Symmetry: C4
Subunit: 389 residues, 4 copies
């Protein structure tokens, strides 16, 4: 074992192949499947695992009642073998909390959870399954982080965190970790005006994080991080193809340097994009209003050209089905000459959209890049809400 | 440590001993057992494992309703320790799809799943637990493969695949894989007119695949593969003993080079044979019409002799019980001077044969050869359907 | 790793400490616990495991109905980590059948199961978890074995098997195994008139088997095996303290060379003794009629002296509670200068004795020698049968 | 792997961070969770596990009825991976009994359990998963031990055990183990008048145990053990800050050398403190009468100064929520220059306090120190009792 470095280029991607699906809600109708939300995947030299925020109750359990609620002393980050559903019998507790990130540096995994009350939350940073570092809230307002994997280079792993209003200017820091210990802290710099829930991946010695501006913008902020100089810049996706949820119709021109406003009724959702000049893909919900459907759109020069639009699409979840959060990960230990993009989509069931049940949970689907021109179908959740009534 | 070489000859077989039985439906009446179909086993240097295509639901779950249906986005190939029943707690997800194959090359396991819509399925080829290769559909008609184990020699693992009509001429390929990467693709050549669901094994550097002609033959096609040369031939099993389901009565002579047609109402079932001159055995369901009973027939020179008939028979499942698919496997890593034949029978319960239940699923029995003359009995599923009403 | 050699003497025993208890019926009332019977324990260099004959159903399952029945195609030898209850999620299938034995030789574990119809049963012998040898029925009447562990010395593992009447003269053999292969077969010789269900242990290069005579004696037969020469003798336990169940009052004298008859209503139960001069301990059910209670009795020279009586006693299960089978095992790999005797008692719940339920199952308790004078209480099952009604 | 040596000082602690929370009652409402009480945590070179005394029945099981009872043949010490709820499917059985301690010495784990009747209990001492030693009751009155982890130094693991009255002068011993073998046995010396349920840690070659006086004191006895010399002293914690439950209001002065009487209705609860000069912290329930709430109090010189009061506080469980036992553990194998203090709180649910249910159980929370000033919230159990009615 060695520290991962990020000096390979991104792979060429012409379509997306099915990597994994857990069918958690279908299985959780009967077997003992934990209630969750904010899932993702993360890899290490050995393979890949699913991660999510448990609600500290099973789906059929009476305590599922009220699981719409975001933050409780009963939530923890759990991980498990990619593909299986999360039960109390197959899940590792990574840390305790209601907001998380995790990543493997080539040697060991670092996992980070926030917990506590809204005015007094704290992060505990674990490395090798051991607690290393604690960080108190600096702004006293729901200290929080990515909800998807971080990225490490040469032992250095940056993590974007935010503390402050959901609906106004907040205080975002980039913290640089090595073996769970803080190497540097940096205030957000650049033109991104609001930063939440960054989806991050590395390629070519650089880490790109594509985020949620929950304040004003229906276009997504992008933070470029040098993990060697331990510095960063920020701005917005240039493309007119707007990828936040609640968004207006796509304008004729996007805006590299300011939030483009509009959309009703939701201020944001976690999302992602891979930005590689011509080899660029943007994900989004199919609905402009709601967390339903999911589509991948190849938009050459999305990161630099305000006029860029799709040259190809793939429907991942059709617009008759609920989606939710979406984020980036890559298996950096694959036996290839390039880093192949992968993404997951969180498939939210129950409240608020389906309120014939008392709970909110989700399942997971995950896909990676193919150089081939693969056919596709919808990878929706597939559970019958009527079975839970 | 090393690549499996197919050097050894086949062991003499005079009868069949019990290897494993999972009792999955009996257990699944209570415990949390996954709905499945299309099982098989496969071994590696450490031991044997059971495989099946999950339906993404447990047997007692309400989602088990409608599981007669073959293809959905909720199926995946799962594997588990031989003899246990498949639950969400003890299963490994090998890949995502509704047709599969799997084998170990002596170093690592290759696993292959097709998924996607009928007019646009794709294969994802997995090696050592990672996705290596994707293959688009070549004929836009349910790209599909073996549904039992492949076989490797010096790192080369041939896989037989088909795309095209179930009731007409289709497009079959032999794909030769080494570490999940395509070394060669051949089009099917020879006298087999239709090819599905091949059951394969190796001995003395030759791989034989005994398959299902869903188009015409109640005789089974036989593909013979040289994995060094990476070439094949194809024809039909010569014996007058027909082993497909829905077959007519055995004629006076079989045909080596052309289908023996007939029988009603079903076109085919996956089956297998071991072919080694004198030491040749054929499995078939006992009913010539439906998937019930299972028998093993020692049919000397089945592969060469149009007049060859049984000189012994072992009842595996009595004709009062449901069977289903059957397939070949060998423990190539046995401490033995020969490769001993083994097989499984899938014990299908529920629909369409038992319509008092809303689901279709199965359990597994597995047996291997013995030089001795062993007594026997029926190894039927053993669940009571009245319990599920 | 090296072959186990039986070079240590038995440790001195003056009472019995608790080793394990799985509370399988209490736990199986809600959790998913397999119906079992004929349990035992067996150790290897890494530790000890619990073993039993599963009925291929869980205890609360509808298929638990009819589990009084001894032989079916749905039974398998299962082993799990000592002190756990056996559920579908934690048990390894050792082999398939309804009579077993198992032992580790210092390198790998050998397991043996019989399956088949009464007149045509067979043994399959496994070594390192792979099948090695098959042995067909020699007398066409329920080929059967120890139902507790076998013992090895320099890789030679003898096994006692019987084929023939339960109620009359049968054909017993002693089979000498090494790595699953048969080295010698001997027919039973000496004074034991009937042999079943041998509980065997080794100390100082000699193996002793304490068996069940189902035909005549309420005294237990004793086979002495030389694992090196591969020869044996047999007679009866000399002591007047009668240990089989159904048995009459203890007579004034025992008989070394012939059975002591009487008792009602039942012909026999599996049981055991440690036999070592002054250091001799006889288990038996407290009740002389039924399978209730269990007591240990120190009877010096029980083996050789027809007049030997108890000098102390420890109640293991009180006579108000159900017992069942009992048997010998030792951790031959403990860091001790002697081999310390252990035993278990099968704690049978349900039919025939408790007919308010439709099933038969058991739980387990295991205790080992102490050189100390330990207090004791009853280790009865502890499930409340009314919960199951 | 070598013997752990208590060579490092205790870390500076200013605040407590969340380590783990198993949410076992919430999860056990549906999923098959073992009823437990008397939990703790213990670490080894590889990670930390949770430990509890199981009741040999699951939480929703009908046998949960009556689990208020402290002692039965159906209890066992179980260990599981930290963060998980204890189920039949993920727990190791450490030993059998109703009182326990456990600790790892850097090489292997020693685990000790007492079982038996009140007047004839015995301890079994286990090492590396094998039983090594047995200790009979010396006073015929419920031989019993710490209910939390022991501590080892150069292979020598002291354990505090008591035998004799709960409400009068009892007979306490300090037993020094090495690889499960007795090195030395001392009778309690010093001014502690009654000793139960010691919580022990190590720093700079010294072991401190903060115990429970069930007889007269609302202050806590403290034993200071030299593991190299194998000698101890005892007294009471000096501070006016009384930390047993039932206690009176805190007095003007404490008492280092005699119990301080008073409080109602409870004679005692298991508790803990870390004593390190200015860096000293005392746990106690928030309620003086009852096992509700839990608070950490930084009391400089608590160990030497009768007038020492709190300089800071952390609410661990609010006084509207039930707590229970509490105890000390340290990850001695952390990659840190100091030994960092951790503790758990047993969060008791059911009887006697909540008698709309027929059972008594608990969940667990654990926390470790921080040099930081971190915010906090209440880590209550989180289950709704109405759901179990
Ligand atoms: C966010 O959480 C952070 C944690 O870093 C906050 O910080 C804590 O802040 C407090 C000041 O607000 C701390 O307080 C002080 O306590 C010491 C000693 O306290 C104990 O002893 C005295 C005398 O015996 C009692 O009167 C105290 O009674 C308070 O605490 C107990 C719980 O133990 C509670 O049950 C009582 O009702 C009562 O509120 C107590 O037992 C005093 O000498 C001092 O004057 C002051 O009160 C605390 O030390 C500090 N903790 C840590 C850890 O840093 C902050 O409060 C939170 N911020 C926000 C915005 O909420
Ligand atoms: C980046 O990480 C790679 C992958 O390990 C790396 O390593 C190799 O490069 C050297 C020469 O520079 C070799 O000759 C090795 O054969 C290569 N090793 C492997 C395992 O592929 C780079 O050195 C790392 N670069 C930096 C800047 O850290
Ligand atoms: C506690 O239990 C132990 C063990 O059973 C015990 O010892 C036995 O004593 C009785 C009566 O004196 C006997 O006759 C047995 O032979 C003794 N057995 C052993 C194994 O030593 C004590 O009697 C019991 N002590 C108390 C106080 O009950
Ligand atoms: C799963 C589902 O029913 N999805 C609806 C979808 N359906 C179709 N286009 N058919 C259309 C939208 C939408 O674009 O508004 O999103 C959904 C919707 O109605 C809302 O979000 C409003 O609450
Ligand atoms: C399991 C079972 O009972 N199977 C039936 C079998 N049974 C007996 N011969 N007992 C008889 C036949 C048959 O004669 O065609 O095949 C089976 C059949 O499918 C049908 O009869 C019609 O569905
Ligand atoms: C567990 C239990 O209650 N067992 C009964 C037992 N009970 C008591 N001694 N209390 C009495 C005896 C006996 O000693 O013969 O045997 C048992 C019995 O059922 C029968 O004898 C009739 O079949
Ligand atoms: C968890 C809970 O409700 N606990 C009660 C709590 N008070 C309140 N939460 N209101 C505080 C006390 C107390 O300080 O004595 O008393 C507790 C109590 O109910 C009893 O002692 C009854 O025996
Ligand atoms: C820390 C936290 O509670 N984050 C919230 C997050 C959120 O409120 C915002 O992004 C607004 O600031 O939104 C959502 C969401 O569904 O929009 C889920 C997250 N839930 C959890 N991570 N548990
Ligand atoms: C890919 C696919 O759906 N294959 C079918 C297969 C089939 O339809 C034919 O062979 C005719 O083309 O038949 C059966 C069958 O039971 O006959 C099950 C297989 N199901 C699954 N593999 N999932
Ligand atoms: C092979 C077989 O069925 N053995 C029987 C055994 C028995 O019948 C005799 O000893 C008489 O010959 O009795 C019992 C018994 O409880 O008496 C259980 C065993 N059950 C099982 N091993 N499965
Ligand atoms: C051996 C035993 O039963 N110990 C009791 C203990 C106790 O009774 C006393 O400390 C008085 O001596 O109190 C408690 C308690 O909740 O107070 C739990 C323990 N229960 C168990 N450890 N099982
Ligand atoms: C993943 C992929 O290739 N998707 C393409 C998409 O661009 C499209 O528009 C369609 C045109 O018929 O064909 C398909
Ligand atoms: C008939 C049909 O649907 N063809 C699809 C097309 O839409 C497409 O996108 C291509 C690659 O994705 O696969 C094929
Ligand atoms: C103490 C003892 O007997 N050790 C044995 C030795 O006799 C032997 O022959 C060898 C293989 O048989 O393994 C070891
Ligand atoms: C769900 O939770 C609600 C608010 O806490 C409530 O009061 C309701 O009764 C409860 N419902 C069920 C069915 O548990
Ligand atoms: C509770 O246990 C007691 C003691 O045996 C009892 O009798 C009662 O019926 C049990 N209650 C239930 C609901 O089982
Ligand atoms: O959707 C983006 C693209 O998809 C494909 C075709 O339909 C294109 O002509 C279109 O621009
Ligand atoms: O069927 C195989 C053979 O089995 C034996 C007899 O049943 C023969 O008459 C038969 O040919
Ligand atoms: O059980 C036999 C022995 O047990 C002990 C005492 O009760 C003795 O009187 C007796 O000889
Ligand atoms: O003679 C009857 C018998 O002959 C031979 C076989 O081919 C069987 O299929 C058939 O039933
Ligand atoms: O097929 C000829 C003969 O051999 C085989 C068995 O199935 C027999 O019943 C059959 O009649
Ligand atoms: O191979 C099984 C077969 O062999 C024998 C015959 O009596 C048949 O009726 C039976 O089905
Ligand atoms: O008297 C015989 C003697 O031996 C033993 C036990 O069964 C005792 O209860 C009894 O006292
Ligand atoms: O359990 C009751 C019973 O056990 C046995 C003997 O030790 C008897 O003395 C006693 O009466
Ligand atoms: O000063 C009031 C406060 O003093 C200190 C503690 O001992 C508390 O219990 C008490 O309430
Ligand atoms: Ca937005
Ligand atoms: Ca056909
Ligand atoms: Ca008898
Ligand atoms: Ca007290």
């Amino acid at each position: 074992r060695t520290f991962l470095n990020l000096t390979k280029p991104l792979c060429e991607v012409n379509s997306w192949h099915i990597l994994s699906k857990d069918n958690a809600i279908r299985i959780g109708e009967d077997a003992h499947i934990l209630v969750t939300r904010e899932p993702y995947l993360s890899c290490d030299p050995q393979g890949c695992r699913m991660f999510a925020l448990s609600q500290g109750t099973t789906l059929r359990g009476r305590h599922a009642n009220g699981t719409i609620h975001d933050r409780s002393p009963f939530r923890a980050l759990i991980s498990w073998e990619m593909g299986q559903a999360p039960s109390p019998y197959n899940t590792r507790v990574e840390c305790i909390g209601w907001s998380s990130t995790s990543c493997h540096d080539g040697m060991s995994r670092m996992s980070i959870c926030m917990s506590g009350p809204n005015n007094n939350a704290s992060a505990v940073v674990w490395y090798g399954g051991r607690p290393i570092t604690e960080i108190p809230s600096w702004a006293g307002n729901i200290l929080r982080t990515q909800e998807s994997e971080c990225v490490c280079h040469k032992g250095v792993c940056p993590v974007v965190m935010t503390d402050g209003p959901a609906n106004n200017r907040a205080a975002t820091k980039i913290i640089y970790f090595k073996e769970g210990k803080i190497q540097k802290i940096e205030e957000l710099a650049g033109n991104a005006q609001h930063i939440e829930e960054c989806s991050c991946y590395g390629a070519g010695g650089v880490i790109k994080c594509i985020c949620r501006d929950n304040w004003k913008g229906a276009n997504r902020p992008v933070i470029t991080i040098d993990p060697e100089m331990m510095t960063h810049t920020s701005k917005y996706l240039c493309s007119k193809v707007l990828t936040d949820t609640s968004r207006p119709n796509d304008p004729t021109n996007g805006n590299c340097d300011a939030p483009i406003t509009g959309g009703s009724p939701d201020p944001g959702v976690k999302g992602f994009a891979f930005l590689d000049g011509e080899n660029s893909w943007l994900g989004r919900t199919i609905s402009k209003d709601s967390r339903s459907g999911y589509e991948m759109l190849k938009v050459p020069n999305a990161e630099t050209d305000i006029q860029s639009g799709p040259i190809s699409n793939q429907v991942i979840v059709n617009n008759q089905n609920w989606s939710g959060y979406s984020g980036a990960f890559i298996d950096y230990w694959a036996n290839k000459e390039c880093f192949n993009p992968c993404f997951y989509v969180e498939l939210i069931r129950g409240r608020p959209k389906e309120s014939s049940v008392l709970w909110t949970s989700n399942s997971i689907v995950a896909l990676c890049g193919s150089k081939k021109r693969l056919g596709s179908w919808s990878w929706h959740d597939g559970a019958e809400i009527i079975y839970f009534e």
